[PDB]
Symmetry: C2
Subunit: 276 residues, 2 copies
């Protein structure tokens, strides 16, 4: 079935079709290379900038019931966690993180407990402007993580706060991690001062969510395409399709989809393990 | 069956009898009041001083296969974790933590994942002397946790390092948490300078492990009784029996057995949540 599914909680909102839900999600994740015997004992923690809105408006007025992608959020954080790095969630507003539970790997003996044990952190997130105002060369963060999910497409791309946050990190030689539509957040720098210019990155292809609606993943088409906007902001998007590969470009680690979440996690842990 | 059980790994070592193993352990724990919506976002982490030796010598030459008690180690750490506080394990030697796996709640859907996700921290612990040498009024610890298990009876009670560590905490108004035979570690102050003098505490009763061997919990009797030694060091031990109750005495939070692990955890989280 490729028909979008009603989300009774909102006026004209829809979840992904049964066909696509089984096409791109699973009751169990690919969590894999969690081998880290010499864990980081420092004090630096990953800063996770998440989405506080679940509904994204499409071309036909219907709302898309999205949010942050669990796999893209939890797999990386899982590896980074087991590697000794703790994480602190923040939202532009401070409202709770909005997840796409339809892509949550219920029935995963490792990912769910991990989630349950850090749920409060997403539920009672910090307001990004508070975090930003305390940012100094000594801020103990080590990296900013912007997880995927169409939710990242709302809010973050026009946030003066996500901008500052990012400029602070690249300025202070910190890592920046992201995947799926998360880089759409980098668009918050398009209005002058873009320390993320000539950086190569791999994200979700515009051509991908150009067609996904043809199978009901979305109740309609996107109002715009973040991919080409990044191209105009001077960033290089490696992939033109969905391949599940991840790329490293001097502290900038990224992936193109739920398919690259595990690899992006290993790449992150192993790379920061070395830096710290 | 009250007969001690051979531990083929050591010369004349024995695990607790089947009767006592079912008397004092369970495949599932009492982990309970894990309700913490406003978690600590600071940087202070609990400092866990654990045992690096598994075998304790008894009155009859037989070795007792003990170590750190999982429940007394993991329940408190579980609550403190979900409350936003991270922990860092240390051993006098730096050798891996030695647990009493015969008391590990295999089959516990929450405690085992928690364990698995922080196993490395116990496996590759830090050497307490290294931690001590960096201790200053700014050390970001907030509390020192000395978990129970007869393992705490070996090494720690004569450690110049556990002593310094403890003096540093009470001096710097930090918390000190412990249960079972863990307070036996406080005996490391008996030789002058005991900021733990007139403090009341509840621990495992001498009379308890005076009789436990009568059912095979231990292959023999203890070479000495830490309980009375604490009494002589000027500390007040509330309980005279095993009751599973926990006590608070100005930053000193303690419990008397595996039975008080959950409560000691709630008391710890809730009390530090307030201090931080």
């Amino acid at each position: 079935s490729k028909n979008p599914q009603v989300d009774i909680a909102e006026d004209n909102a829809f979840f992904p079709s049964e066909y696509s839900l089984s096409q791109y999600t699973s009751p169990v994740s690919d969590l894999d290379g969690v081998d880290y015997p010499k864990p980081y004992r420092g004090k630096h923690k990953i800063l996770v900038i998440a989405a506080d809105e679940r509904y994204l408006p499409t071309d036909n007025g219907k709302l898309f019931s999205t949010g942050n992608h669990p796999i893209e959020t939890l797999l990386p954080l899982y590896h980074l966690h087991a590697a000794g790095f703790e994480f602190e969630v923040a939202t532009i507003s401070g409202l709770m993180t909005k997840f796409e539970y339809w892509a949550m790997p219920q029935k995963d003996e490792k990912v769910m407990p991990f989630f349950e044990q850090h749920k409060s952190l997403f539920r009672n997130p910090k307001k990004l402007a508070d975090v930003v105002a305390s940012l100094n060369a000594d801020s103990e963060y080590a990296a900013i993580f912007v997880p995927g999910g169409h939710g990242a497409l709302i809010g973050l791309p026009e946030s003066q706060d996500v901008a500052a946050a990012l400029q602070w990190a690249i300025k202070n030689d910190r890592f920046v991690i992201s995947l799926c539509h998360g880089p759409a957040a980098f668009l918050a720098l398009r209005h002058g001062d873009n320390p993320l210019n000539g950086y190569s990155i791999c994200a979700f292809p515009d051509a991908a969510d150009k067609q996904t609606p043809e199978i009901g993943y979305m109740p309609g088409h996107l109002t715009w395409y973040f991919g080409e906007e990044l191209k105009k902001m001077g960033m290089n998007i490696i992939n033109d399709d969905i391949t599940g590969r991840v790329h490293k470009d001097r502290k900038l680690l990224t992936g193109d989809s739920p398919f690259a979440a595990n690899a992006l996690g290993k790449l992150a842990a192993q790379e920061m393990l070395a830096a710290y």
